[model samples]
Target: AQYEDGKQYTTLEKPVAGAPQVLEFFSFFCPHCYQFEEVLHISDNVKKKLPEGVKMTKYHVNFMGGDLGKDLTQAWAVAMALGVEDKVTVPLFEGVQKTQTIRSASDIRDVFINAGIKGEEYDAAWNSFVVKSLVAQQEKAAADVQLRGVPAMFVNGKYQLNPQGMDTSNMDVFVQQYADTVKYLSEK
Candidate 1:
């Protein structure tokens, strides 16, 4: 089946060459993003269907929770550096969006502690130069995308997929169409 260009996807300002990459922009404060991650399991399913070597990189948006948005984005970078995103993503999403427990960076650190990542380790990664640069890059990516909302997906740094145009009649079909759209977009 063929997909429409303007309706299904839009081209970004620049294109990246080499391997396929999917850039996912999301915010912890966005309820729909949380539901997409936790309840719908869309990201994981799409990853399963993505082409081999297609890398999915997540950039936490810095515009949602004000200062807290910036802080949690840093925490996200720290989690990635510590290889604890699997342990931290849901907890942070729940704490910020569901549990209403995360307020400051201190609370974010507690999330890492609760996930069994030692406080010392979390602090080190949080303060590390690499993580700082990672956070900066995250912010820059957000600015570059100029998104109107969270849960945006970009393919190969060159195309942004509009999931709204996809077939969403059923969960299975939607996932397939979504993943296939990503697959085709990545190839371009």
Candidate 2:
């Protein structure tokens, strides 16, 4: 993701702390992000190939204009804090993309409930101090990174992954190469 002062670069931040091997910048509303999800799910080989201390962290860029995006940002913070990110993330994505009605905070809560997360527990997690801090941290990071678009990945804060530049029709190929790139950088 290339950032211009007023366009995509208006706000950005680091996805994780302490020099991660790969930082993936994505938006919940992006179709490309959705496509990349499958690649990530099937890529145990990619993970196994990663260098020691290399890991992937994702930032949910709130580039989509709407209340739904805001809700997603909040939900992401809550999930991260509660250690249930994997449980809620994929379902949230599917709910947003597949169903026309699940776009608000309450609707998302319902999705969480359906996914076996208790309502009260989810609510408690939503209001937890950890979740609040993470949300604030994400805002700060967005400002630092000056990110502009979805599915942009950064390797060691230097190399960038642009789906458009990769030119691969298959999303899995793009993600596999991305993982490989991150592994290579981690080794260096």
Candidate 3:
């Protein structure tokens, strides 16, 4: 995969053991992260490139968005619990980072409602024990990684990818190289 542990990525202090997976740590408040997902469509492109049984998971970090970071993370969990992430991810990013219109949890709820999720359904998921647990899990995951930035990706929960070290000459090459690295690491 043409990757090095110290240069291209960092090996985790305690590696995780599970089915092959990629976990992306990101914040809704990061413009670069917004570009990565909305402008470059990296997540979708990489997902298409990965082989079967390798799951790609996204974790909204609780370290950004000031006092609202935790709430935003909870909103993400609620969206996922309701199976409405695909419908709301872009708009939520736009709402929070682009237009700067989403100022509170109510606004975040509005994004979900606009995505076709009933208000009551959104509330139900928002208050559900499972979704709360997901938010807690995400918080712990970010803390465990000692995360310092948004849009960080881990392959098999061991290698933290360094996109700055990758070939970013063009979009196609970048995505392919990233997918290849994930595939390579997944095999380890």
TM-score of each: 0.91, 0.80, 0.93
Worst 10 residues of 3 by lDDT: 13-22
Each candidate structure's count of clashing pairs: 0, 10, 0
Deviation in angstroms for 116 in model 1? 0.4
lDDT of 1 by residue, 16-107 (tens): 44423788888999987887788777788779878887777887877789999989889889988888889999999989988899989999
lDDT scores of the candidates, listed in order: 0.82, 0.65, 0.83
Winner on lDDT (1 vs 3): 3
Q: Where does model 3 exceed 4 Å of error? A: 18-20
lDDT of 2 at 101: 58
Pairs in clash, predicted candidate 1: none
Candidate with the larger TM-score of 1 and 2? 1
Backbone collision tally, model 2 = 10
lDDT of 1: 0.82
Best by lDDT: 3
Ranking by TM-score: 3, 1, 2
Alpha carbon deviation, residue 171, candidate 3 (Å): 2.6
RMSD to native for every prediction? 2.0, 5.5, 1.7
